[PDB]
Paper text:
Five copies of VP1 intertwine to form each capsomer subunit that also incorporates one copy of VP2/VP3.
The capsomers that occupy the 12 icosahedral fivefold vertices are referred to as pentavalent capsomers, as each of them is surrounded by five neighboring capsomers. For each dataset, the constituent capsomers attained approximately equal resolution. This refinement also improved the resolution of the virus–Fab interface to 3.1–3.3 Å, with sidechain density clearly apparent. Therefore, one Fab was built into the pentavalent site and was subsequently docked into the remaining five sites on the hexavalent capsomer. The heavy chain made all contacts with one copy of the coat protein, whereas the light chain interacted with the adjacent VP1. There was a predicted salt-bridge between VP1 R77 and D99 located in CDR loop H3 of 8A7H5.
Numbering used by the authors:
A (entry chain F3): 56 to 370
B (entry chain L4), F (entry chain L3), G (entry chain L5): 1 to 98
C (entry chain H4), E (entry chain H3): 14 to 112
D (entry chain F2): 56 to 329
Write the structure that this text describes.
């Protein structure tokens, strides 16, 4: 899902750019950037809802799925051997030769998890004015504008991958700090004429376990797949318009059933009851920025009478 | 918005003579300037597209030149069918202005 | 209040169309633009009033006028860009007739 | 931290080159080089102060932290897929096409240690006149000028990475002889249009142990992270000005507590008295 | 002792500004320069006395004069470079009025 | 510092005639030479930037040429509005000199 | 199908004079236009191939020019052996049309 949505099915509206972007129109000045949502390649995501499993509440434990391994493969590499067609020719001084194939910046990411991918916002110039409809940007989530810290790393420009086709890949990158129930792999290759490179195979498989031997436990019951496969550009003839190209990605996830420990004290539903009948209070800030809680100390055992009762890192 | 100012507001000239009308833009438009001819009662015909080329069917007396902030349209030997108004249009950012 | 510009002889949905109005003594004045991938660009003095649209499979532009129409009156032409691109700046040479 | 400091937060002073360099202005003659500190990419460093641990002075030994492993990752590769914008176009004869993306010389180094990175000074022509303020050069540390031996290897042009954003990466390289409590990894890729290449992954991790199975013991109590991630250039439109680009680096250090032998005879404090 | 050059109509902080003085019979004489990334370059005969600066968000240059002003007197113009670059050599075409 | 020497210190000429003023620099300035015109009582107007181009609004009689150590500014047919002083400026290293 | 329209249907002219015959195509043909000369009773000889070159043996008075939608063939000084019909042919898509 990179630009052109799949809805206008007829191959006459524009020649059916489904699978491609719509165009690219450079900025008109330093400050004027309006990237026109059907130009931006975005993240693809899907959620397979698995059934319910056993519960053993008589003594706290619970069964849930567990993505053990994955075979993935980008389908459709050979289709880039279509060297007829109305693209920029290889010999432009006579407009003859070969209609140049797909080349350019490539970006291959996929991710298999038990919960939606956590994303982090980075950008080139933060003065870009993205449309405020049909796309999710850093302004949509942090209701204020974009600041200079959004050009390097702002720990407040975080998101999830709930929607599909709305998070452009040039703004939202997989979060390294957050993703715990998600294994994501990726690679980027810049340039302007970098030849694409792909390898597909029926045999080799990825393992999604971690150093404890667990692998993504499907929370709720869903299994979340995310991907983006940008293969380059396509330079048309009249001007040098530069539609993107993206190929589908096939997933094959092998999962099993694991016994875990039920985290939540389901009796806490009475708390939910107590949370429903009790009013919604405004109160005075006791959590956050202007918190009014001076100090909290927890006493557990019986330690001998200490000297200076607060002695820690000395610097 | 970019403002296009033309120096000859109204020029009286005969047939066989040379005329040169210039245009200045507030900001920079690289080479995106078109030259339109409108005779009274007709839709404006395109004459010089992208400030350096002659549209098909336009004779060789018309010439578009310049780039950046100062563009110009020149006619070496006027013809009787060249008695129309002439506008310059920047098509380099939105909104377009004539 | 709702204009119309029927076109024939080409593939309508592959080209970008401008609306340009001319007051008979004030010269030409650009109004609006819609491209192949329909995304509207208006002039500064007409932003909130006009709405330019196109309806593919019927080959017609629709410049829905101010819905107020206080001080805007002129000859309204439509113009088609020269090449079938998604490039926004294409030196439209195919003007309409006027209305 | 490559050039433009983060202080003028408004995106109107220059378009907010935070994350980029300010420009590049070539020398005017063979001898005239003044690289204008906000042009030079520099080293990034940080120090996480860990707490104090046990001491067992009744029989000489001591507990201290130990960086066992690290997961690092350069964040923000996909942002270089911003191919709109006011950069040099791919078709300059008409000024059309694609605003060329980030390309060029790349330099990725990171380092996890128990003490600040030891650096060594090398340069291209030693006749370069770096500013004497806001940056640390070989003249700032060896109070004399720069000599020809600074073009190859001078065992006296050594430093540490105490400051942050002040040691340019074109002068100060990680010292191979010195660094003992520091594991540093790096790679450089020259050229003028070399396409960038990055790979990120949630899974694979580096091990910071050595042939004795120790790994960086955090001296004092701090843990020192250092990095530089130069991804290429960016060629503007009016002239060919060539701002740098750099992406942040995420560290995740796994440490544990090790019993070591207390080196210093703390009774030597009386010597301090003496 | 402290000059001032207010500017309007553009983004002030993106351009480089020169100070040039002209003695009415000796022709023009360059004085100082400050670029977008503020870094001052002076002339050889005026190095230690003048200090050129700019204050963004108020759009004004400040050529703080010699603080002595012994033998320097002329018409002082300001000039703005043509393009908004960090290139130091930009053929300033927008001169001031003079003072 | 670079020193720019101009050969015509003062040239008396009439309207319709040709004038050529040259400039020599001590060291090498590649193509960074500007040509300024100053009429008495006005801020110096730019005429020929970078030694080979005509600034916007400057007529076609002005011509800048040369590169390296010898630059020149030429006027083919003088105009009455061309009665001003003309300086050449090197903008290739600091400090700039006129 | 592309339709080629020629403006001079029949032009009467003498020897030593200049003639220019133009061709317009419905759609765009980039540079694939040929210019054929046919004298009565002979197979049509090629004159100007690809709209910008002179076939071997063709004199220097013939000139082909244009690209896109408007092509032209010009003769500066007519010769007696230049009294034939002249067609323009687009060879840029199938079917070819004269």
């Amino acid at each position: 899902r990179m630009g052109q949505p799949p809805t206008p099915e007829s191959l006459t509206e524009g020649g059916q750019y489904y699978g491609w972007s719509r165009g690219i129109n450079l900025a008109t000045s330093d400050t004027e950037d309006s990237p026109e949502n059907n130009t931006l390649p975005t993240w693809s995501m899907a959620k397979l809802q698995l059934p319910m499993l056993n519960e053993d509440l008589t003594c706290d434990t619970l069964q849930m799925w567990e993505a053990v391994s994955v075979k993935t493969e980008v389908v459709g590499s050979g289709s880039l051997l279509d060297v007829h067609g109305f693209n920029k020719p290889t010999d432009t001084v006579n407009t003859k030769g070969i209609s140049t194939p797909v080349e350019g910046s490539q970006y291959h990411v996929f991710a298999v998890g038990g919960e939606p991918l956590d994303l982090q916002g980075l950008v080139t110039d933060a003065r870009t004015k993205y449309k405020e409809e049909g796309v999710v940007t850093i302004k949509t989530i942090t209701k204020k504008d974009m600041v200079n810290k959004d050009q390097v790393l702002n720990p407040i420009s975080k998101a999830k991958l709930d929607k599909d086709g709305m998070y452009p890949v040039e703004i939202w990158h997989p979060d390294p700090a957050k993703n715990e129930n998600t294994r994501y792999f990726g690679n980027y290759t810049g340039g302007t004429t970098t030849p694409p490179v792909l390898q597909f195979t029926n045999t080799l498989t990825t393992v999604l376990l971690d150093e404890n031997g667990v692998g993504p436990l499907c929370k709720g019951e869903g299994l979340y797949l995310s991907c983006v496969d940008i293969m380059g550009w396509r330079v048309t003839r009249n001007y040098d318009v530069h539609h993107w190209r993206g190929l589908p990605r096939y997933f094959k996830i092998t999962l099993r059933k694991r016994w875990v420990k039920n985290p939540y004290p389901m009796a806490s539903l009475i708390s939910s009851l107590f949370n429903n009948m009790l009013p919604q209070v405004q109160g005075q800030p006791m959590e956050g920025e202007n918190t009014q809680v001076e100090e909290v100390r927890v006493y557990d055992g019986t330690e001998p009478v200490p000297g200076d009762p607060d002695m820690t890192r000395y610097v | 918005d970019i403002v296009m100012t033309q120096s000859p507001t109204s020029m009286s000239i005969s047939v066989g003579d040379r005329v040169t009308m210039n245009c200045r833009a507030s900001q920079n438009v690289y080479s995106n300037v078109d030259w339109y001819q409108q005779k009274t009662g007709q839709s404006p015909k395109l004459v010089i597209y992208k400030a350096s080329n002659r549209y098909t069917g336009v004779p060789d007396r018309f010439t578009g030149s310049g780039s950046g902030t100062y563009f110009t349209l020149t006619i070496t030997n006027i013809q009787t069918e060249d008695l129309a108004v002439y506008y310059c249009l920047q098509s380099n950012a939105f909104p377009f202005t004539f | 209040l709702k204009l119309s510009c029927s076109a024939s002889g080409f593939t309508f949905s592959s080209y970008g169309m401008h609306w340009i109005r001319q007051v008979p003594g004030k010269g030409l004045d650009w109004v609006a633009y819609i491209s192949s991938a329909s995304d509207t660009f208006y002039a500064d003095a007409v932003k909130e009033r006009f709405t330019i649209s196109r309806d593919n499979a019927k080959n017609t532009l629709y410049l829905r006028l101010n819905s107020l129409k206080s001080e805007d009156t002129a000859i309204y032409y439509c113009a088609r860009t020269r090449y079938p691109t998604d490039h926004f700046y294409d030196w439209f040479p195919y003007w309409g007739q006027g209305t």
